[PDB]
Amino acid sequence: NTYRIDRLNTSSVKGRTSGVALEPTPVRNDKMLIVVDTVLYIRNPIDYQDDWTAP
Amino acid sequence: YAGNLTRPHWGGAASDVDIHLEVYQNEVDTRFQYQAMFLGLSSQRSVADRS
C-alpha cells in the first residue's frame, strides 16, 4: 500500500586561500511515502418489490 | 414346534427377545395438497415489470 520516492540535497561552494583546510560537507537525503488507505464506494440497494413494479 | 425355543431368530439379542430389525423407508406424509379454485374464477392480468 505504500510507495517510495527518495530525495536528495545539494552542497554549497566554499572558498579557500593557500593553507586552509577544505571543510567537508554532508549531502542530506530523505524519502517520501504515499499510502492507500481509503476505499471509495457507491452502494445502491433496490428492493425486490420495487424491481418487480418498476422498469 | 419341534425346533421350539432353539431357533436362530436372525435379528434378536441375548435370548433372542429384542427385535431390532432394519426399518424400510420410502417417502413421507404431510398435509393434503390444495389447488387454488379461483384460478378459473378470476381473470388473470399481470403487470410483470411495468408498474
For residue B20 the three cell numbers come to 431390532
Query: Would you list the DSSP string of A1-55?
Result: ---EEEEE---------SS---------EEEEE--------------HHHHHT--
By residue count, chain B amounts to: 51
* Residues paired with A32 in a beta bridge: A5
CA distance B46 to chain A (A): 11
- Elucidation technique: cryo-EM
Residues in chain B closer than 8 A to A54 (CB atoms) = 49, 51
Task: Let me know: does A55 contact B49? Beta carbons within 8 Å.
Answer: yes
Give the A window 23-52 contacts with B, CB below 8 Å. 51-52
At B39 the three-state DSSP class reads: helix
**CA distance linking residue A19 with residue B17, whole number of Å:** 123
**CA distance linking residue A25 with residue A33, whole number of Å:** 27
